Structures are given as structure tokens and as C-alpha cells.
Design an enzyme around this catalytic site. Structure first.
Site, PDB file in Angstrom:
ATOM      1  N   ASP B  25       0.762  -1.230   0.000  1.00 51.01           N
ATOM      2  CA  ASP B  25       0.000   0.000   0.000  1.00 51.01           C
ATOM      3  C   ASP B  25       0.804   1.298   0.000  1.00 51.01           C
ATOM      4  O   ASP B  25       1.333   1.710   1.028  1.00 51.01           O
ATOM      5  CB  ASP B  25      -0.863  -0.058   1.268  1.00 51.01           C
ATOM      6  CG  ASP B  25      -2.118   0.803   1.291  1.00 51.01           C
ATOM      7  OD1 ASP B  25      -2.183   1.746   0.400  1.00 51.01           O
ATOM      8  OD2 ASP B  25      -2.985   0.649   2.091  1.00 51.01           O
ATOM      9  N   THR B  26       0.889   1.989  -1.146  1.00 47.96           N
ATOM     10  CA  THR B  26       1.624   3.266  -1.261  1.00 47.96           C
ATOM     11  C   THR B  26       0.854   4.389  -0.558  1.00 47.96           C
ATOM     12  O   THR B  26       1.349   5.461  -0.359  1.00 47.96           O
ATOM     13  CB  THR B  26       1.812   3.656  -2.739  1.00 47.96           C
ATOM     14  OG1 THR B  26       0.532   3.697  -3.317  1.00 47.96           O
ATOM     15  CG2 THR B  26       2.572   2.573  -3.498  1.00 47.96           C
ATOM     16  N   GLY B  27      -0.394   4.170  -0.167  1.00 50.37           N
ATOM     17  CA  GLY B  27      -1.160   5.231   0.488  1.00 50.37           C
ATOM     18  C   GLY B  27      -1.180   5.121   2.000  1.00 50.37           C
ATOM     19  O   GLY B  27      -1.729   5.962   2.726  1.00 50.37           O
TER      20      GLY B  27
HETATM   21  C1  LIG Z   1     -11.232   4.018  -1.526  1.00 50.52           C
HETATM   22  C2  LIG Z   1     -11.475   2.510  -1.573  1.00 50.52           C
HETATM   23  C3  LIG Z   1     -12.406   1.957  -2.461  1.00 50.52           C
HETATM   24  C4  LIG Z   1     -12.651   0.582  -2.524  1.00 50.52           C
HETATM   25  C5  LIG Z   1     -11.907  -0.268  -1.704  1.00 50.52           C
HETATM   26  C6  LIG Z   1     -10.954   0.267  -0.835  1.00 50.52           C
HETATM   27  C7  LIG Z   1     -10.187  -0.711  -0.023  1.00 50.52           C
HETATM   28  C8  LIG Z   1     -10.758   1.654  -0.727  1.00 50.52           C
HETATM   29  O1  LIG Z   1      -9.813   2.182   0.048  1.00 50.52           O
HETATM   30  C9  LIG Z   1     -10.218   2.589   1.362  1.00 50.52           C
HETATM   31  C10 LIG Z   1      -8.985   2.580   2.252  1.00 50.52           C
HETATM   32  O2  LIG Z   1      -9.064   3.064   3.383  1.00 50.52           O
HETATM   33  N1  LIG Z   1      -7.840   2.051   1.734  1.00 50.52           N
HETATM   34  C11 LIG Z   1      -6.663   2.062   2.598  1.00 50.52           C
HETATM   35  C12 LIG Z   1      -6.229   0.622   2.931  1.00 50.52           C
HETATM   36  C13 LIG Z   1      -7.330  -0.252   3.533  1.00 50.52           C
HETATM   37  C14 LIG Z   1      -8.102  -1.099   2.732  1.00 50.52           C
HETATM   38  C15 LIG Z   1      -9.092  -1.942   3.252  1.00 50.52           C
HETATM   39  C16 LIG Z   1      -9.373  -1.916   4.617  1.00 50.52           C
HETATM   40  C17 LIG Z   1      -8.615  -1.086   5.442  1.00 50.52           C
HETATM   41  C18 LIG Z   1      -7.610  -0.268   4.908  1.00 50.52           C
HETATM   42  C19 LIG Z   1      -5.616   2.988   1.983  1.00 50.52           C
HETATM   43  O3  LIG Z   1      -4.884   2.343   0.972  1.00 50.52           O
HETATM   44  C20 LIG Z   1      -4.574   3.617   2.885  1.00 50.52           C
HETATM   45  N2  LIG Z   1      -5.234   4.720   3.490  1.00 50.52           N
HETATM   46  C21 LIG Z   1      -5.314   5.858   2.567  1.00 50.52           C
HETATM   47  C22 LIG Z   1      -6.355   6.809   3.119  1.00 50.52           C
HETATM   48  C23 LIG Z   1      -5.683   7.379   4.284  1.00 50.52           C
HETATM   49  S1  LIG Z   1      -6.595   8.645   5.133  1.00 50.52           S
HETATM   50  O4  LIG Z   1      -7.154   9.496   4.166  1.00 50.52           O
HETATM   51  O5  LIG Z   1      -7.862   8.211   5.576  1.00 50.52           O
HETATM   52  C24 LIG Z   1      -5.992   9.292   6.580  1.00 50.52           C
HETATM   53  C25 LIG Z   1      -4.663   9.643   6.692  1.00 50.52           C
HETATM   54  C26 LIG Z   1      -4.178  10.174   7.905  1.00 50.52           C
HETATM   55  N3  LIG Z   1      -5.019  10.326   8.950  1.00 50.52           N
HETATM   56  C27 LIG Z   1      -6.299  10.000   8.861  1.00 50.52           C
HETATM   57  C28 LIG Z   1      -6.824   9.473   7.680  1.00 50.52           C
HETATM   58  C29 LIG Z   1      -5.519   6.307   5.298  1.00 50.52           C
HETATM   59  C30 LIG Z   1      -4.772   5.086   4.860  1.00 50.52           C
HETATM   60  C31 LIG Z   1      -4.843   4.028   5.929  1.00 50.52           C
HETATM   61  O6  LIG Z   1      -5.966   3.491   6.174  1.00 50.52           O
HETATM   62  N4  LIG Z   1      -3.606   3.916   6.544  1.00 50.52           N
HETATM   63  C32 LIG Z   1      -3.350   2.970   7.554  1.00 50.52           C
HETATM   64  C33 LIG Z   1      -3.567   1.557   7.008  1.00 50.52           C
HETATM   65  C34 LIG Z   1      -1.880   3.047   8.032  1.00 50.52           C
HETATM   66  C35 LIG Z   1      -4.275   3.216   8.753  1.00 50.52           C
END
Ligand SMILES: Cc1cccc(C)c1OCC(=O)N[C@@H](Cc1ccccc1)[C@H](O)CN1CC[C@@H](S(=O)(=O)c2ccncc2)C[C@H]1C(=O)NC(C)(C)C
Lengths: 99, 99
Positions: B25-27
């Protein structure tokens, strides 16, 4: 273009001509942007991540210009902390994760 | 190795010897894994995602075997639907996003 991952791989994209800074995210299946108005023709959806779900509005065949490329793709709008471009657009752009 | 993003880029890693399936995960800025007991040596952290916040346990200098490399990195442990390897680990492996 190549992105080291030392900093968040964020770029400027134009969605329906409005610039938005977006995160390139191999961990997001789909894409979701905040702060843009795309109109009334959407389908209601939910998206989940760490901490729960959010309501989103899904829009199809949205015009996007990013990385000197022009695609049409589905985008969801919603209260997302950062704007995310998931693998739906990344695959359309032709991006890969390499080692 | 090159991952097209048609499928989620999920691989098998060994965390302190234990096999887990993880998402590259690059995000994600940090890394979070569920279902493994790392030890007693932790600090509790708060972590923000799309839906809200989660409590986690942070482990420093955890030994990881992935994609044929061995790294030591910080790993959090928590209520996570998918095991995530975010930028800290991606950078250490020499991974990049390419277009
Ligand atoms: C948008 C989307 C559509 C369809 C399917 C999925 C899975 C989606 O993505 C949601 C997501 O939260 N994806 C994160 C990974 C994930 C997938 C499935 C379940 C749980 C988590 C993401 O790559 C990585 N994201 C990117 C969004 C940022 S953020 O915008 O929400 C944010 C940043 C700082 N503070 C607060 C919020 C948070 C971060 C993440 O959850 N990072 C950790 C895994 C380290 C918690």
C-alpha cells in the site's frame, strides 16, 4: 515517471477540469475525492477502510487528466481525509508497483 | 518484480517467522497487521483511516521476510480487515510506483 516512496506519492489531477491533489494508492480498489461538485447523476455507495465506512456518491465516466494522461473513469465523492486515486485509475494510467 | 494493478498487490511475508498475507500500500504511511502476537514490548498508538480511528500496538525493530528481502521495521498491530505494508516497509525494500 517514477515515485520513491519516501514521501506520499501525491500529484495534481484535474477532475472535470478542477485541480485536486491526490494520493496514488495501490491499497485502494477505487477512487474517492473530496471538495468537488460533480452533479446529480450518481449512485449512492458506501466505502470502508480503517475505522469504519463512509457514504459516497459514485460517478461514472468522469474526465480526468493526471500525469499527462487523459482517462475517463469512475470516481466517488465523499468526506475523505485525503483524495485517493485507487487501482481503478492506476490501471488505466498504466502504473505498476515494482521491486 | 512488477505488479500490475489489475488485482490487489497482496503477497506472503514472514513477520518474526509467522506467515501472513499482506497488501502492498503506497497510500499507507505506516504498517498494520492483525492476528499475530508480537510481544510485550509495545506503545499504544492511535491510527486514522477512512472511517475513523483505531487503537493499535506499536512494535519497533520487527523482523520481516518479504519479496526475498529481509528488513527490520516498525509494525503496528490492530483491528484491521486487511494486513497492510505501507511506505515504511515499501521504502526499506526499494519498491517504487512507476509509470
Ligand atoms: C477508496 C477505496 C475503495 C474501494 C476499496 C478500498 C479498499 C478503498 O480504500 C479505502 C482505504 O481506506 N484504503 C486504505 C487501505 C485499507 C483497505 C481496506 C481496509 C482497510 C484499509 C488505503 O490504501 C490507505 N489509506 C489511505 C487513506 C488514508 S486517510 O485518508 O484516511 C488518513 C490519513 C491520515 N489520517 C487520517 C486518515 C488512510 C490510509 C490508511 O488506512 N492507513 C493505515 C492503514 C496506516 C491506517
Amino acid at each position: 515517471p517514477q515515485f520513491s516512496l519516501w514521501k506520499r506519492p501525491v500529484v495534481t489531477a484535474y477532475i472535470e477540469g478542477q485541480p485536486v491533489e491526490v494520493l496514488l494508492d495501490t491499497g485502494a480498489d477505487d477512487s474517492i475525492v473530496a471538495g468537488i461538485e460533480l452533479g446529480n447523476n450518481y449512485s449512492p455507495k458506501i466505502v470502508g477502510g480503517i475505522g469504519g465506512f463512509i457514504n459516497t456518491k459514485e460517478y461514472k465516466n468522469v474526465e480526468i487528466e493526471v500525469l499527462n494522461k487523459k482517462v475517463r473513469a469512475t470516481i466517488m465523492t465523499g468526506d475523505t481525509p485525503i483524495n485517493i486515486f485507487g487501482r481503478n485509475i492506476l490501471t488505466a494510467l498504466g502504473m505498476s508497483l515494482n521491486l
